[PDB]
Write a protein that binds this ligand. Sequence first.
Ligand SMILES: [Cl-]
Ligand SMILES: [Cl-]
Ligand SMILES: [Cl-]
Ligand SMILES: [Cl-]
Ligand SMILES: [Cl-]
Ligand SMILES: [Cl-]
Lengths: 446, 446
Amino acid sequence: PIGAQDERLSTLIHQRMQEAKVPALSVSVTIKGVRQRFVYGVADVASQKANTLDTVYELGAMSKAFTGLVVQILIQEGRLRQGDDIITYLPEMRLNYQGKPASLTVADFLYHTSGLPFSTLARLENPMPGSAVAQQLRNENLLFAPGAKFSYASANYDVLGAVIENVTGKTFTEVIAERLTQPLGMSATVAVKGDEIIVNKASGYKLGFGKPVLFHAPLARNHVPAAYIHSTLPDMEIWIDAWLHRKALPATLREAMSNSWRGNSDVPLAADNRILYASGWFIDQNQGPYISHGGQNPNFSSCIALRPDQQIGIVALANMNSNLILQLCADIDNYLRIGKYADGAGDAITATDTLFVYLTLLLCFWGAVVVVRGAFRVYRVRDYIIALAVPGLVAAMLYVAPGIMSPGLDWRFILVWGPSSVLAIPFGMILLAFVLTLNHQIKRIL
Amino acid sequence: PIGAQDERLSTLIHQRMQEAKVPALSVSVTIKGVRQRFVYGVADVASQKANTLDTVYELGAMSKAFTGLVVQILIQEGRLRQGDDIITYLPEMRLNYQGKPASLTVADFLYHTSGLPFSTLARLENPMPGSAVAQQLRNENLLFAPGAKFSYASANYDVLGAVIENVTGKTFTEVIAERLTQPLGMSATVAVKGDEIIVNKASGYKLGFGKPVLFHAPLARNHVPAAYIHSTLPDMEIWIDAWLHRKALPATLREAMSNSWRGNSDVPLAADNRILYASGWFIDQNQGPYISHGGQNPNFSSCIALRPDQQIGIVALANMNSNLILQLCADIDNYLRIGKYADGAGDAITATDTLFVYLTLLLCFWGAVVVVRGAFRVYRVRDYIIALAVPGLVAAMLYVAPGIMSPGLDWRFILVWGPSSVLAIPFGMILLAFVLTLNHQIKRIL
Ligand SMILES: [Cl-]
Ligand SMILES: [Cl-]
Ligand SMILES: [Cl-]
Ligand SMILES: [Cl-]
Ligand SMILES: [Cl-]
Ligand SMILES: [Cl-]
């Protein structure tokens, strides 16, 4: 009775999938009760394990709507106030502004008005077994007064995870399960505790030399509330369906939802962007309301978009980081709205991969110019010690160069988020520097 | 009775003015009937002529709201249809898509859904005495099907200027005066016919080597409807006031206004931008409605913003191109809304000026290394002919390099829009290339 799914929808999704080169991609579209599912590709490439509805994905920053709804549930029960100071729950977290400890509220983390620098993502995403969030951020220097500006920082929702635990006295996992996944019936959603083996989880990939490459990304327990809630497409359908049909929902959960979609208007807006952030969702009233959020991980990415007044919900899930997946929801919504859609935008990882492939061939053409000029002059101890300084000196500068241009970012961070080809640039430079040393020393020796 | 103007408003405006380094800046703010005026600096620097309320500015792209309201007036009278094909009025303008002539409507130019490439701005802004717009754009190749995408192109409103003339049988100047400036009472607003002398017009400036520099910019008659309507602050106050109080207005002008603020929803929207374009205005419903448009000329810039439901109107006018002036209206509106505002954004011209100043000193440090190494070896006909090839060859490549990287842009365009320092880079390269030739030829001569 429901009829066939839309064939022009399938073309768009396929095309975006082939452009992005993600191995697996799952998409689901609700329009007033009728869903359309699009499940393509492979969750694991080497074993050829198929993308099925049981495949489990990391939700990326779409984790934050879970964390924030829980903050709203605890507020609705009266175990928390939006305006509570964070020090009441995280007594050891001193965060500074202009040298003085600052007053940061719970709202300041909900709405990314905290001033936490971008580098806090490097700190919170590296595993630290016996280390609490408050110690990891202790004595960070904020970028502005709290509440003065919107500035997205993923670590803002790891502070909130830690507040949930102090308030309930329970682990994040238990609070998520007991307050959200059990009562909504999302029987395959979970907040993980680390990288214990999750059956059905897709393998994650990252672009490198033009092909997807298997990448085992870190999964730090303290970072779960901002990045690493795991789920499946049927479950995200139930999640969508809940936000759209809050009638048969208990009154606490319904009220917490209503307050979870209340954007923070007390910030400056740009000339081209008056969109508001709520409790882990962007709120846009233009051709709206249009509630969306994207997920971006080192080896996963995803998006979600809701248009409540027309009962539309879009979610897409993929086991690779691609801007074409962060935009796919806007594409699908353009199609559902006016029957047309833009050409795929670019992708930052893919452009960077190409840049390195060129640079690496450039560094290889240079090695040939040195060795072709070398077998020319060749066919016609203190040397070995001096020539190891040129590569070892460039390799030393390359080592500390990240920490100087951007204080707080290290090579670990670069490797985690960049193309797999990113290591060829230093080593190619190291190899080119070693050979260039031997040439200009053996040319004075003639 | 009205009270003092707001002192925190004055600080913000002063500060933005000193950051941007514009010589003169005029700002006016309406909030339910009470205006606040801020008139600072100098309209002409060499003669020290003061910025007064009589100072006349080029409105930049804020010209388009004038052109488009006239299109709406002619539509309301029934002398034009939104959906009319452009060829009915510009019979010689053939514009191609995929090799075939395309059907472009009047709406396609109103809402920047035409496919006109960015380079059409270079063509329409260079003076051409006996040359009509339709001949200047004849056989351009569009970037996409008409109506398929929003893509801003200033030449879209020069096509509309030409439609107004064919329909009325009158010049653009006469139609603007008779339909808008006379009936609204804006007795100092005019659409110019070229660079005849306009008493009271401010001098225009462009950044160069860190200081503002007097710049005589082109003013091509065919480009007036998109860039070069001239006006004053009292007159822009009357303009604002008209859009906000359409009651005592004749019914044709009131209806044309209502249709002039109707955004075009039939385009794809980005994930972070669902704002619509209307008849020369951006329409944003977020914290709105917020109707705005900025003006950007080579040596002027300006902005306007209206919030009709709260009777707010902001306009700013300056005799230099600065992003800090394109954003000033958003700043003022943030202040009027929540009493706070962001730090000034960057400026593309100023960053580019600094980049060149560094490059030019780099090219000068290189000349010293060559001449210091030269007076060293010096104190211890076929040469003059060979050494003029290195600079003349680099000067040839520099000449055609713009037309190769971006087809349709020439050095004329670069000089018009870039920092005054932009010429030092080629000539410094030319001088460095000539000296480098003499060094490696007189070093083989030893
Ligand atoms: Cl509990
Ligand atoms: Cl445990
Ligand atoms: Cl935003
Ligand atoms: Cl007439
Ligand atoms: Cl004339
Ligand atoms: Cl837009």
